[PDB]
Write a protein that binds this ligand. Structure first.
Ligand SMILES: O=P(O)(O)O[C@H]1[C@H](OP(=O)(O)O)[C@@H](OP(=O)(O)O)[C@H](OP(=O)(O)O)[C@@H](OP(=O)(O)O)[C@H]1OP(=O)(O)O
Lengths: 49, 56, 106, 56, 49, 56, 56
């Protein structure tokens, strides 16, 4: 990965491996993993922005 | 030659508002004057988002 | 017939001006870059050509023959180590191009 | 003039009542001040900053 | 310890320096890996059609 | 408060900067063109106070 | 002439939008707060000759 992130920083999310092309599972139902962050956190991001 | 198509357009990002506001130019047009300096918002009878939320 | 390196540098000035002007108008059109880099490698000024191929990869990094010509210049001119770096960067950025892997393992 | 040249006074020059024309050409200046300040400002800004070719 | 006063600007003074100077576009940020699929095999027949 | 200055001060400044051809005043050439954008406002304030034919 | 002056007065009285209360700007109080403007008291003819030479 270090020859992929030459001019980038250490926080930049680049994708460089085969395991980024593999499909995730069906992720059954209304799961707390895939949730929009929080209403008050969204309002805080809105205020800062 | 002189008469030719394009095959590549111009890329934005190198002029008058693009990177440092052309390094802060003191040039401004007549269309860049203050005009309509107040956003109108939807009122209670118009379609305000509180009125649109409870509706079926 | 050209004598001592004043006139050789005048020749090089004319040719570099011609190629840089073709690069200015076309901008893309990858062959222009390849001709100019081949001309630079023919005169063993290969640091110029390193610059030209790096500029051409800045223009279009997904063009696979451009990576191939840059790496075959660095292989051909006995720069094993530059070419080896280029192949590593090539297989990193364009990993589904099998050309790159075959030529690097070869 | 019709009010001025009424009786014994004839149609000679002799009439300085410049208050009216003075007001008219100062009320003109009242509105030509921002227009000319913008125009002269962009004039000077193009002379001292330079012209932006394909900036706008 | 340093006391900073900001230099007082002349109201009647035009812009100082030439800003219209124009230079070509610099290099873009380092290329991202392309992450495509294996690539469908192409036939002579469809290549000619 | 900023107070009044002697009236001979602006008189000698205007008189020494004659037509701006001396090499000694070559740093103020830039400021006079800068002041060009405020000439219409100075014209307005000038003619606004014209002195009224009963005044000497 | 009387008809046309009546027309100008009626077009004044019609399109009278009310003063539109803004924030006051005071340009000349901002110039003389700086270190580049002084203040004096001059005859109007001397200032007019100054303004004409300055515009020239
Ligand atoms: O030639 P007339 O139709 O008789 O009008 C003239 C004309 O005024 P108008 O422009 O209103 O026609 C004169 O001005 P100009 O011709 O120079 O524009 C004016 O004298 P001024 O030049 O001083 O304005 C003169 O006024 P007077 O004759 O009172 O000197 C006035 O004639 P009437 O006064 O008879 O209209």
């Amino acid at each position: 990965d270090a020859i992929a992130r030459q001019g980038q920083s250490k926080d930049k999310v680049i994708y460089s491996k085969y395991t980024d092309l593999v499909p995730k599972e069906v992720m059954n139902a209304d799961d707390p993993d895939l949730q929009r962050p929080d209403e008050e956190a969204i309002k805080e991001i809105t205020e800062k922005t | 030659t002189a008469a030719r198509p394009t095959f590549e357009p111009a890329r934005g990002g190198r002029g008058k508002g693009e990177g440092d506001l052309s390094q802060l130019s003191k040039q401004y047009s007549s269309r860049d004057l203050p005009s309509h300096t107040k956003i109108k918002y939807r009122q209670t009878t118009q379609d305000a988002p509180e009125e649109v939320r409870n509706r079926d | 017939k050209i004598t001592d390196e004043e006139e050789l540098n005048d020749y090089k000035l004319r040719k570099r001006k011609t190629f840089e002007d073709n690069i200015r108008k076309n901008r893309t059109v990858i062959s222009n870059w390849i001709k100019y880099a081949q001309w630079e490698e023919s005169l063993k000024e290969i640091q110029r050509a390193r610059s030209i191929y790096e500029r051409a990869l800045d223009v279009d990094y997904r063009n696979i023959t451009l990576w191939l010509k840059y790496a075959e210049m660095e292989m051909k001119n006995r720069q094993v180590n530059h070419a080896r770096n280029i192949w590593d960067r090539a297989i990193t950025t364009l990993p589904r191009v099998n050309q790159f892997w075959y030529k690097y393992t070869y | 003039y019709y009010r001025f040249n009424t009786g014994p006074v004839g149609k000679g020059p002799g009439c300085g009542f410049w208050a009216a024309g003075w007001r008219v050409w100062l009320f003109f200046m009242r509105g030509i001040t921002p227009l000319l300040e913008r125009w002269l400002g962009n004039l000077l800004a193009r002379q001292f900053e330079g012209r932006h070719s394909k900036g706008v | 310890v340093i006391r900073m006063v900001e230099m007082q600007k002349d109201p009647m003074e035009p812009p100082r320096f030439k800003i219209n100077k124009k230079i070509p576009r610099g290099p873009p940020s380092p290329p991202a890996p392309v992450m495509h699929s294996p690539s469908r095999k192409m036939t002579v027949k469809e290549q000619q059609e | 408060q900023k107070e009044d200055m002697p009236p001979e001060h602006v008189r000698k400044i205007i008189r020494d900067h004659g037509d701006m051809t001396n090499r000694k005043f070559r740093h103020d050439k830039r400021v006079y063109l800068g002041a060009l954008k405020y000439m219409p406002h100075a014209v307005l304030k000038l003619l606004e106070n014209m002195p009224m034919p009963w005044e000497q | 002439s009387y008809q046309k002056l009546l027309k100008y007065y009626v077009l004044n009285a019609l399109k009278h939008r009310p003063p539109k209360a803004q924030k006051k700007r005071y340009l000349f109080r901002s110039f003389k707060a700086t270190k580049f403007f002084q203040s004096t008291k001059l005859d109007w003819v001397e200032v007019g000759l100054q303004v004409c030479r300055q515009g020239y």
